[model samples]
Target chain A: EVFHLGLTKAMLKGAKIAVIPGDPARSERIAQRMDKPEFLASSREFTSWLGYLENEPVVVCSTGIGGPSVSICVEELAQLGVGTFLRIGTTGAIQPYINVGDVLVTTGAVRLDGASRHFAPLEYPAVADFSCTNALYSAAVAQGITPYVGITASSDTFYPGQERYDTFSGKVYPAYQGSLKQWQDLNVMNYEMESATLFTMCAALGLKAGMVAGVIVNRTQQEIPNEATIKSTEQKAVAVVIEAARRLISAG
Target chain B: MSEVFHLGLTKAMLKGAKIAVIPGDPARSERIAQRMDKPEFLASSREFTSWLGYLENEPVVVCSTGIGGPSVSICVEELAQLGVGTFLRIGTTGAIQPYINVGDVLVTTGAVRLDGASRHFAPLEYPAVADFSCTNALYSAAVAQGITPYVGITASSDTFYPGQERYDTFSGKVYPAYQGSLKQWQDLNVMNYEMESATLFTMCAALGLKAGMVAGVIVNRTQQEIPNEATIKSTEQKAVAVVIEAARRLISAG
Candidate 1:
């Protein structure tokens, strides 16, 4: 019996694939966009939905904000027969050239989040599954959406960890000044909190996983897109994930 | 403008407290609360269960951080915002050293940053060391209680099996170096493995918060020894008593 997710293997209802979004609201929104959406469970930070995307049974589960919750969602879902995992969420671009509202396909992630470190060694790379990454990028291109494919620096805290410099705490580490440049220099494209844990755990469990995030903020320009722009780009990213999941299902 | 985004804590509930005792499991919080005077249940949100209490007339908060760094990081960040300046993490561990017997207490001086949550705060090169003052208080308090607390490094990982080189009944992948991992940490004089200290230490260091950890050893991986249930409970009680006493001493000195 799964404690956190409130799920049993039998409750999965024969879905071997799941698309994980970080918010419960987003999980429901994504599921509603699919065919024959049915609410599965709502427990803690985890909320699940079973739906049909392109005639294939798919699960949409909320991983609740960070890597620890994401790890729990993945572990329980995997036990319930989920083999393919897709992270569809929002991100902040670290690279100046990547504008807010751009669809960023995560090829891999810098495992800066501690949850992934528990799954694998720091030296172990959090690489996205090639097939899922290729399909996500190809699907976006096919939809006339040119996506930026690169690495994301998955952080633990939204403010200081991202070096945002704007917090009520007013406490900043000496390393905060150089953190962004270091990640950018290393070719990290964006910042988010969950993908590294997703990739690392998926690899350890011998499952395929991919991530596509809509850039909601640009760190360099200190810019955030309006709600409309954020929604539009996130929907596009979601469509790409659905396309990729469809292709993966048919191929399998 | 309250953003109950996570942990479901209000500013007022945390604003008055300066010190917090964080345990990885929620049940432990209730255990620690029993030793305090006028313990009041604050909130129970997701994995974070908080209670406000008094030790030696010093106000202290006990909050459960759940299992890993991700969850623990959330608690520390929120507590820091709510005016908590000191943290004492009392939890359990599996010792890698043969001499570190089950039921022993391990006071963390630093930790191997194998956990990913702390990496988000600072680069890997940055040390995850406990606050010197807080650690000393904890050590002294443990000594006063007739407990021999070992001060050394801890290895905090997200998972218990592969991260700690234990057999993964699920993964089934043979790690030839699994046994060697014990030797590696033992050679480095590392004390034990748990899930939250690296994040606690790193977050404290970065946020200018004083923090220390004292974990009870329940399993000794080297000797394959598992303490009886009574021994585990007694060790945990010792850690909790030391933490409460240390909190009292530190708060009184202020």
Candidate 2:
């Protein structure tokens, strides 16, 4: 039977790993980096694609955005016999020194989202899969890119939850005040919304998951940039996701 | 467009949808939405899956709150701010009592705030009671559907295994605090265990929005460790029907 993601077991065709992104449109583009790319499915917030990497079938899906969608991807895909996953996403840097257009290799994430809390306790950290993390570094280095390896932060809300004062709410509450400073002080490298839950839930379920985010803006630095920078940085990030799959495909 | 960042929805997209039927599963949102006229997928951002439709000739939304307190709380706050004032959470649950059968629908009157997401909303001492009018709406809807629901307190735990006191802990042991909790909650008359009700109730109350829950009993813990998918789906339809009917009543009353 086909899963809720609208992908059948036969469609999987022995694919064991997937690179997921936050937007449906991006999943197919990432799949293009692989050979014989084919659109697989688009259901709810999920957009899945089929491709080949390292002479083996590979899957790419967009998790929409947030923990619930990512959790759905992990659960439904895991049900279909997928054991490894990666999320190559666009993110804003929380640290001042992290430049725009660079990629971040997330080792783990600070659990600022409820999705992980539902799957695991707060004390249970959201750490990435070792093989995927190591391979992410290897993939980046092979492409002559230096990756920032460290913890990132994820929030259920991109605005107030991430302490952005310039949203519809006008000003975030005092609780969100200085949150970025604290996260940065705690060594968190950047801010994206899905990795924390993805890492936490994946680890709790004993599945390997990892994330690589392309920096689009430095939130702490009060960034300067746009789509020309955004799309290009994303292209570099997609290569990392595709290349990392090569090493993980062999390791698994 | 004025930014409504997280939910991928603006107030304009909801078509003035003031009522929402929330489910835990994204696919279930579509199923619930089908009961309305011309139901269309509204938004799918993060864990939230939203579908908009008309009932009583008024727009009603069926959105997935994802899972747990955090997801529930986020969706509740954002959607309420976007003008969805009435919320009904339709979900599946695990029966804590031997008397509660699988396929039973439980209408939550209140929940024990056992999750942290709710604590962020109000003092721990604050009540997480479902809105009185909304609870009555659910009860009347269940009666109209010719089903008597178990109406009582439910427990919302963040973690399914150890927090719910399931024996499938990573170390083959539940936390000491949670040890014997299933029996204790059973003794306390908590009818079921689900992930989001407490947070939903509490957050809605804090924001002064209406909230109620009707959950299909998926598992009878005394007799089964896992749920039957076929059995759950049957009950799911029942809960959906009641919520949909109740939403119509709410819309008409307002």
Candidate 3:
């Protein structure tokens, strides 16, 4: 049932450790692997599921796509007392050095997105939680999955919106490569839609947040063979997150 | 003629003189008064005149008040050219501080009007800044001679807009405190309110570029209760020379 009040009180009772994934299918996959997993609620693109992973209370909430929707989830989830957030998703690989199916752990997001500005002043930096980053890094290493780590641009409009000339809108926002231009100029890695808002709100509101994504397609190289490649690459990513959470629980 | 371009350039040129004044009038009165005993540009205030006093090359520019279409025209004109760069103005004011005499000074470093016609960001705090450097100059000039200057926030409104607590064409926009807050602008210490520079030089460019303003009162607040004290020769003389000296010294240092 898509209950609006899932975050109201009752559903949030035992939810302490939380993970955010974009696709509801990914949420189900995470639930199936957990101990005593049960669906808390489902509405639109956001589906909530609370489960236990190695006896640690874990909640996975789906934030479909885009900063607007993701911010609403961050705000509402925080009220429900789910402080730690790790974004689990697949990104379109755009860097040349990165091969297809590369795992990426975002350190901080550049604020090219418009939504972050409405909340904090522009000069405020949005970096990831170091502890979360290190935990995920160690987990990826233990799992033998290589993860690319660096800066990523989080834009609101995804398609032609990232300033790429698109077939749908066909209008390109003016931005070109300069030394200062990292995302637009150099062959930067990955294009995900939600990291800017996630890191920005966490940094402002004092929450533990980080992002772990799988780069399935090279947007810069223009090579996306099939959905199979994306699925397999993201599965490894899913394992990285699952192991990272369990490790954090054990280390504590 | 209120031409938009001054020195064949688009931006209003302050001639880099740090000390100056912004008047909301384009008449012979404000013009002649700015150069009362000084000599700089004879046509500085045809719309506005920037003069250096003969006693010393104390720089001063008398800006013209071109209402409506011409308002921005004259402002951008002087800003684009003219040796008079760092600017300020003197003006007649009327409001709640009925005891405030005709010859008072107001300094500004910011403005509250954020009309989107021009896309400029406005600081919510200390909206109008009479530049800290210039404010210090004007205050010292006054205090050295034992003149007690009234300092406050001045609202540079487009028209007597209702939100400004004035009833003009848009009295419907005036929600409440129609007359009460108008006096509060004075009670709150806003020295004097005029026109022109509040829109162009002060809020848009100077504050954006970190400049300041110090204006003179032509209209006496106390005389708003009594007539005929509207214009004065001596007060304008003291303000014009003081501003020119401030500008010349601020420029010479650079």
Candidate 4:
């Protein structure tokens, strides 16, 4: 019933799981990969679809670009009795060894984003739900896709927040020196914008959430894969998340 | 060529402009612009409506930044791209402390970076502080205008309900730990609650732009009293006057 998402309780009544993507266009694309997917709602960065995966009712919703918008989607979805969330999207790889097109299955996230901090203290950990995390990792392995299982740093701004060099000046702030090194030393896998808010809110509300993102850019090399590789990785990620959702339904 | 996809502004419209005044509401942006000398409308798209005018013979732009940190960040980034190097956020807030009454003006020196937009610019430990010159100018202007100006920290939130511990008819659930947050912030000597100052401060600082805030207190959360309409109008005018005077001081100092 939030003003932004324009969704009703009745619309999401029986769907207990949701697949969250950051782009509205991606939500539509992901829906095409599911069974009998029906468009449910489309409202300002929040496009939703309802479908079945392995006979398990699921929802696909777009969360727009950052933590603030992502938090809104989470709050509204939770209000409508959606208990499980799988954030399936794209990420930029921060670790040198993690290459583009690799799937990053996030076990936890560094709460570097602001929206999550508003819900809980910084000391609180944004860890993925154990069941969801295991299921995603297991599903990826079953599909013969080797996934990198580790932590990610979720930021708010796409450029400066991730310590990426600014396009206007081709420069980075001096304050961010050694940021990548510090995160790499801590075993962080990738960087993205939404998962921290997703994990934090789910933890606070006693719901389950996990994240499986396709690595689109390798920050260390400043390299991005070609369009075909990018699309192939996304397809793999979507399959992994839906497979994970099916496992969660059976276990529940 | 740079883009203005969300803001509906082009690079030419903001070229050479150094000072920008940010407001949370579109109506307030128009009201603030009308108070300036020879105001001209620039663009209107989505929640962003912009106007440019002269204040004390210096070019000043008024840009409405919508409600939360997300929209405010978008406006600030676009303004920066267009050559705006100074930012002054003017808005209304609710006082959290008991001594701060409705109609009082709070000059924001720093903010608790609770808004998600600022975190994207710097680390959480990075202080969302106003530039000293801008902060002092706003403070001095408020004092010279015969208004009670309190210099302190403010909490900038994304949502109004669970964020400020206010009840909402749409969602009946009250967030846990929020009930005690008002007292926690009060004890920390935070003065008020608004939506965009933290993001404005952090984004400005990260971009090496001067920024500050002067906000009128609309509600006293401790006292639970909103000022009468007449008093509210006067308080807003006083704040607007101080911001203009501060703009003059900055222009003179430069």
List runs of model 2 lying over 4 Å from the truth: B1-254
> Candidates' TM-scores?
0.52, 0.52, 0.48, 0.52
Q: B195, model 4: CA deviation in Å?
A: 1.0
lDDT of 2 by residue, A119-198 (tens): 65453446666568778888999999998876677889888878877777689778778877766665567878888788
CA-only RMSD, every prediction? 21.3, 23.0, 15.9, 20.1
**Candidate 2 residue lDDT tens string, B160-253:** 8888887765589886888888876676556888888878876776566888889888778688556667877888788888998899889888
Tens-place lDDT per residue, model 3, B143-237, is: 66556665443455555465356554633456564556566455433444444434453333322232444555656533434435335555666
What is residue A14's positional error in candidate 1, in angstroms? 0.9
Leading candidate by lDDT: 2
Error of 4 at B173 (Å): 2.4
- Local error of candidate 3 at residue B162 (angstroms): 35
Residue B170 Cα positional deviation in candidate 2, in Å, after optimal superposition:
26
What local lDDT does model 2 show for residue A65?
Answer: 78
Clashes of 1: 6
Q: Calculate each model's fnat, 2 decimals.
A: 0.00, 0.00, 0.00, 0.00
Instruction: Tell the DockQ for candidate 3.
Output: 0.02
Q: Candidate 3: lDDT of B248?
A: 49
